[PDB]
């Protein structure tokens, strides 16, 4: 239903949806559970660029978090991490090239200086 609500309702609603998925994620034990929960939060965020676009500090945190999961060994997660990353890079492309508020350098730069550390563990297709 992304885009069927007013941006302002969208915000309040998404803050509630993911604050508690995050909370659930920490709650449930077993990587099997955490992997499912984690993938879902990622799917959700991926579907709400407009949200991401208006909140850089959250966007950046999601992307850095996506980079972390690219080293996750649990089956499927790496595919999730990359798939979400491409949605986000398309839909939020400008926010990576222009200096955002509270930062001194375009985020793309930090990415380019670490390509290797980030893709380390990824399979060819994911790369």
């Amino acid at each position: 239903i992304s885009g069927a609500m007013h941006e302002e309702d969208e915000k309040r609603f998404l803050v509630t949806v993911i604050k508690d998925l995050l909370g659930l994620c920490e709650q449930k034990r077993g990587k099997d559970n955490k992997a499912i929960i984690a993938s879902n939060i990622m799917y959700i965020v991926g579907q709400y660029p407009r949200f991401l676009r208006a909140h850089w500090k959250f966007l950046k945190t999601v992307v850095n978090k996506l980079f972390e999961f690219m080293h996750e060994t649990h089956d499927g997660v790496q595919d999730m991490a990359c798939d979400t990353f491409i949605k986000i890079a398309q839909k939020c492309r400008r926010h990576f090239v222009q200096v955002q508020v509270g930062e001194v350098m375009p985020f793309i730069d930090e990415i380019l200086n670490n390509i290797n550390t980030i893709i380390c563990d990824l399979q060819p297709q994911q790369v």
Binding site: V15, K19, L22, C25, E26, K31, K34, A35, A38, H55, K57, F58, T61, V62, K65, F69, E72, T73, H74, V77
Partner: peptide
């Protein structure tokens, strides 16, 4: 609207998401 900031505090929360990393606990 001015909109100073708030989403900044919502970021520190996501910092708590375990799944693998190490986990050296067992029965």
């Amino acid at each position: 609207g001015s909109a100073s900031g708030n989403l900044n505090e919502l970021a520190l929360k996501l910092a708590g998401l375990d799944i693998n990393k190490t986990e050296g606990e067992e029965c």
